[PDB]
Amino acid sequence: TLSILVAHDLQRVIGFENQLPWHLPNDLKHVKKLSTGHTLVMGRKTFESIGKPLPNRRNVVLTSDTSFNVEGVDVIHSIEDIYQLPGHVFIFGGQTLFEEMIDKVDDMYITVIEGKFRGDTFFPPYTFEDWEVASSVEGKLDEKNTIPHTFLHLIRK
Ligand SMILES: NC(=O)c1ccc[n+]([C@@H]2O[C@H](COP(=O)([O-])OP(=O)(O)OC[C@H]3O[C@@H](n4cnc5c(N)ncnc54)[C@H](OP(=O)(O)O)[C@@H]3O)[C@@H](O)[C@H]2O)c1
Ligand SMILES: CCOc1ccc(-c2cccc(NS(C)(=O)=O)c2)cc1-c1ccc2c(N)nc(N)nc2c1
């Protein structure tokens, strides 16, 4: 299975200055639950933002840099390489990867951040005419998680 995993705000903002615009621990819990024991494919900038491979899953980085060889990370140099990866593969960002893959993936696991943030990178437009809502679950708010958010699982029609 090939899936997108993304958090985007009401205007599809996903990033600002190579980091997430929001602090939302619940989204990370969501990422952990979905991707632990599976595979993440990410662009080079996204990887450098995180700074290290995420534990307990396969981390694959897409880059044109032929000098890229980082411990605990597998490297690929083409979109076509993604299709050779076994198991459940999650496209993990950033904007360039999402743009390249939104028409190819089976489904999407979106955290809708129900706010309007300043962004410099965006998730591409999509329409519910193309995507069935498999589930929609409101995130619980507390002291640590103060921005309303909704977890959507969309499946291509
Ligand atoms: N909210 C979210 O769900 C989320 C998730 C991930 C990232 N982000 C945000 O997204 C932003 C980064 O997005 P971005 O688009 O600037 O960068 P990105 O997608 O993370 O990485 C871009 C880089 O990926 C490589 N790449 C992409 N397609 C390639 C291809 N077909 N062949 C070879 N290399 C390819 C290139 O690396 P080289 O230049 O090294 O060749 C390219 O410069 C940041 O603000 C980050 O915080 C948000
Ligand atoms: C571009 C910068 O983005 C990040 C930086 C740090 C961490 C992060 C920090 C600590 C621990 C973990 N691991 S965990 C708990 O998520 O499994 C991740 C996670 C993200 C990050 C990266 C991609 C995504 C993505 N595709 N989707 C969603 N819903 N959230 C993300 C969060």
Side-chain angles (χ1 to χ4, degrees):
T1 307
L2 184 59
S3 302
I4 271 170
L5 186 50
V6 62
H8 75 63
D9 82 354
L10 290 169
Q11 298 182 310
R12 280 175 289 98
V13 167
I14 61 168
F16 182 67
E17 290 185 341
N18 285 321
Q19 291 300 337
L20 305 179
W22 41 80
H23 171 76
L24 188 61
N26 278 348
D27 175 68
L28 303 189
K29 291 189 195 70
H30 183 63
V31 168
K32 187 174 185 199
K33 185 171 196 187
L34 282 172
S35 70
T36 295
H38 303 295
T39 298
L40 300 180
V41 176
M42 67 194 82
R44 187 262 301 171
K45 288 181 179 175
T46 294
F47 176 72
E48 300 296 330
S49 299
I50 300 160
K52 50 100 198 210
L54 293 186
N56 301 327
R57 71 216 82 175
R58 186 189 190 171
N59 294 245
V60 178
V61 173
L62 176 62
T63 178
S64 73
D65 185 359
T66 55
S67 290
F68 192 99
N69 188 11
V70 176
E71 182 184 344
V73 179
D74 295 338
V75 67
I76 58 163
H77 303 297
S78 175
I79 284 289
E80 298 314 303
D81 296 329
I82 296 167
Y83 308 115
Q84 268 55 56
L85 301 167
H88 196 168
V89 175
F90 291 90
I91 305 303
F92 198 57
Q95 170 181 288
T96 302
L97 260 301
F98 293 138
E99 289 179 351
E100 290 179 282
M101 296 300 295
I102 190 166
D103 292 341
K104 319 297 190 183
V105 297
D106 296 316
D107 60 343
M108 311 198 282
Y109 288 93
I110 300 167
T111 302
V112 186
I113 311 287
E114 309 269 5
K116 292 176 50 189
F117 291 77
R118 169 116 92 95
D120 61 18
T121 45
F122 284 76
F123 193 72
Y126 58 97
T127 173
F128 293 93
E129 298 198 283
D130 287 344
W131 298 94
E132 177 163 28
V133 180
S135 59
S136 180
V137 177
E138 173 182 346
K140 302 218 170 133
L141 306 191
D142 55 37
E143 204 70 324
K144 286 215 70 210
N145 295 266
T146 66
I147 310 151
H149 52 289
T150 300
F151 299 115
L152 301 181
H153 181 203
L154 308 183
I155 302 179
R156 184 188 305 282
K157 294 196 184 173

